[PDB]
Every structure is written in structure tokens, then in C-alpha cells.
Write a protein that binds this ligand. Structure first.
Ligand SMILES: *[C@@H]1O[C@H](CO)[C@@H](O[C@@H]2O[C@H](CO)[C@@H](O[C@@H]3O[C@H](CO)[C@@H](O)[C@H](O)[C@@H]3O)[C@H](O)[C@H]2NC(C)=O)[C@H](O)[C@H]1NC(C)=O
Ligand SMILES: *[C@@H]1O[C@H](CO)[C@@H](O[C@@H]2O[C@H](CO)[C@@H](O[C@@H]3O[C@H](CO)[C@@H](O)[C@H](O)[C@@H]3O)[C@H](O)[C@H]2NC(C)=O)[C@H](O)[C@H]1NC(C)=O
Lengths: 209, 209
């Protein structure tokens, strides 16, 4: 019955911030038919057509439709400087082509402030205690947070999604749970944050009794 | 054709004596040709007849929204009774049925901890007071920061997040002028939840060497 639908995805945050990763924008076409699987993708960067996108392997979904996907590698600095990426999709089951445009969220970046907070004394009655990392004042909301100890990632932590604050920046908390004895024995735990507005896109704060 | 949504009561409505909780059966995209909607309601399988239909509302897109509300007893909802709405309309080939109840699972009492601002935050104009609320089930909860009985103007509370033990946690961040912390004013984090004694608890935070 219904024709295809198009969704355009930004790079993953870590891909935009890590030297070792390659960020890409992903143009996804769903509900493509078996009678007309062919999809034309045209790509534009700030309105200028580009030709280095690549089509991923066509994929039949469990519901017997085709998913057709084009990916365009982006330069780290291009994405972070706010370039606009446009995908134009044509298919014979569409009456007209579909255009979508994506870019990094607009707004002046702001550096996260990272504060480690020890467990409350009242939590010391429990088997495990909570080590809290408050990350606030950041913009845009794309960010990565990890808790580590002795250079290894901790097994049991959860990070809230960024939440808009009253000044137009974002904040989050990351809660690390550890056995009480590991806190009491004086081990050092570290909260690591990646964000475009940090120096070298990275900072780390440590916490210990 | 029309679509049917069934909403539970507001969390505060379920926990406050002074409030009346209700379940709301919402029918959208009702036509002008056949605005008539029949509602049947059932409580644990047993038809009831004390629901009320809200005033019909034409929406900005020129469709009708038709809503039936059924009042629920505080104890009935917390004891997990199940509420079914059956909807009939000429533009439906078959009636639509929807059931809703308190989320299944044994309740667990929130643990509430207040965490003072980091010393590293003391060069800022304003400091962050943190309320960690963890280990609670189900996720329905309300949180508020106060001082001298009056609610605070500038706090934000994260949505509940599922933790690794199947309970929820959240943080509530209160922002105050540094001078109000430095001068020893007392702030309080108040939490309402079904598994608290009297459905309420309060924890204070202040600078007090
Ligand atoms: C057949 O199966 C595929 C795979 O499950 C379905 O594809 C999915 O289609 C929905 C839209 O109908 C897409 O939802 C979109 O997701 C994005 C990302 O969260 C969101 O931004 C959009 O607002 C929207 O929710 C979903 O991405 C897509 N999943 C995949 C893997 O491509 C397809 O709809 C099914 N077709 C039929 C007729 O059932
Ligand atoms: C015409 O305007 C009305 C009112 O703006 C639109 O009603 C909305 O319809 C959508 C689904 O079509 C409803 O979304 C649902 O919301 C619930 C709770 O947020 C969610 O659980 C569901 O999965 C879904 O997202 C939405 O509740 C409803 N809004 C209101 C005020 O009733 C309607 O869609 C428009 N109809 C047409 C033909 O344009």
C-alpha cells in the first residue's frame, strides 16, 4: 500500500569526537518494494552536490520489505563547523522525490563542567554505594561519559540522557555503583567525558575517599 | 479511521489524598459524519457504568477528539486493578479495546540522599545541590526542592532511569546563588512515592562544619 519513507541520521557523538573513528551521515529508505527496489541518492554539502557517498548492501527486512541505505563520510571538522548535509531520494513508488537535511545542532558550544560527588554518609549502611558525576553547562547535547578504575571501565554505571537546563545548556548525571568495600579501601575512580568544547575534546575527574 | 489511547492517572493524583485519580480513554480522528462514540468500561473484567464523557472538542485540524474519563479509587489503582475501555464508532470495522493498570512489579522504597556542591564549583556564581533518589519501583514519583517551606525556583529533575537491579533512579539538581549556600541556609528535597511511609519523605542539605 504505502510507498517508501526516508530518515536521515547524524553521526554518532563518539564518531565526531574521536580521532580513531570516521563519522558519517546515513540516509535510510524504508518500505522499498520488490517491484521497484532501485533508489537514486543525491547528496549535497551546503547546497553543493557531492559524489563520494556509498550505498550499503540492500537488506530484506523480516517483514519482507527492502531497506536501502546510502552513507556519506563527513570530515570531523566539517561536521563540527556546522555544514549542512542534504539527501535527495527518488524511487518509482514515490510521486515526487523526498529531501531531508541534517546538521549539528545550531548554537554556540559551551564547555561541560565536570564534578565528582562522593556517596552520602547515609548510604554507607548499604552493600553498595553511589559515586556521582555531575556534568553540566554543556552545549550541544552530544556527549560521551564513562566511569573507569585502574584504567578499566567499570561494570555498573548508568548515565542519564542530557536534560535541558534553565540557561539553555544541558546537564546530566552518571551514577557509578561499587561495592562499599571498594570505596572504603580508598580506590580511585575516574569519570571521563568527551565533548566538542573540551580541550582536546576530553576531560577526566577522579574521586576517592 | 479513529485511534484510541488509554491513559493512566497522573502520579501525584494517585499519591495525594487531596487529588482524584482517573483513567482517560481518548479517541482521536473522529469524523464529522459519525461523531458518535460508544464507550464501555470494565474493572477486572466487570462492566461499570460510572464513567463520564468529557466535552467534545474540535481540534485545529478539524477532527473531533472524544474522551471518556473513569474515576478510580486510590487504593484500587495501587492494588493493581485493571481498567479496560472498549470503543465503538461507525468508522471502525471492529471495536477497539485497551487495558491499563499500575505497572506490574513489587514496589520498592526510594532511598533519598542529598549531596552538597563540589568544592570545585565554588568559583561559580551559583552552586548545585543534588538529590539522588534510587532503588524505587514503580517509576511513578514526584520530587520537589524547598527552603523555608517555599518551593525553589530553579531545579530540574531527571526522568526515572532503569537501573541494573530493575529499580529506578533519578537525580534532582537544585541551583542556588553561592551566597545562600555559604550562609548556611537549609534546603530540603521532598519525594512522594507509594512505597514511602505515608507516601512521602524529606531530606535536608546545608553547609554546617
Ligand atoms: C518493516 O520493518 C522495518 C524494520 O523494522 C520497519 O522500519 C522502520 O520503520 C519506522 C517507521 O515506520 C522507522 O521509525 C523511525 O525511526 C527513527 C529512528 O528512531 C525515528 O527518528 C523516526 O521518527 C521513526 O520512528 C524505523 O527507523 C525503521 N526501522 C529500520 C531498521 O529501518 C518498517 O517500518 C516495516 N514496514 C512495515 C510495512 O511494517
Ligand atoms: C489532529 O490533531 C490532533 C490533536 O492535535 C491529533 O491528535 C494526536 O494524534 C496522535 C496520534 O495520531 C496522538 O499521539 C499519541 O500520543 C500518546 C501520548 O503522547 C502516545 O502514547 C501515542 O503512542 C501517540 O504518540 C496524540 O495523543 C494526539 N493528540 C491529542 C491532543 O489528542 C491528531 O493526530 C490529528 N489528526 C490528523 C488526521 O491530523
Amino acid at each position: 500500500l504505502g510507498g517508501p519513507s526516508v530518515f536521515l541520521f547524524p553521526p554518532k557523538p563518539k564518531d565526531t569526537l574521536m580521532i580513531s573513528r570516521t563519522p558519517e551521515v546515513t540516509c535510510v529508505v524504508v518500505d522499498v518494494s520488490h517491484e521497484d527496489p532501485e533508489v537514486q541518492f543525491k547528496w549535497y554539502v551546503d547546497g553543493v552536490e557531492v559524489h563520494n557517498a556509498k550505498t550499503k548492501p540492500r537488506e530484506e527486512q523480516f517483514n519482507s520489505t527492502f531497506r536501502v541505505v546510502s552513507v556519506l563520510t563527513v570530515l570531523h571538522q566539517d561536521w563540527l563547523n556546522g555544514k549542512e548535509y542534504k539527501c535527495k531520494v527518488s524511487n518509482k513508488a514515490l510521486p515526487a522525490p523526498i529531501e531531508k537535511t541534517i546538521s549539528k545542532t545550531k548554537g554556540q558550544p559551551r564547555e561541560p563542567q565536570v564534578y565528582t560527588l562522593p556517596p552520602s554518609r547515609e548510604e554507607m549502611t548499604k552493600n553498595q554505594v553511589s559515586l556521582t558525576c555531575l556534568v553540566k553547562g554543556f552545549y550541544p547535547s552530544d556527549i560521551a561519559v564513562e566511569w573507569e578504575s585502574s584504567g578499566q571501565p567499570e561494570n555498573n554505571y548508568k548515565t542519564t540522557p542530557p536534560m535541558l537546563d534553565s540557561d539553555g545548556s544541558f546537564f546530566l548525571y552518571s551514577k557509578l555503583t561499587v561495592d562499599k568495600s571498594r570505596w572504603q579501601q580508598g580506590n580511585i575512580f575516574s569519570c571521563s567525558v568527551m565533548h566538542e568544547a573540551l580541550h582536546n575534546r576530553f576531560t577526566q575527574k577522579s574521586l576517592s575517599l
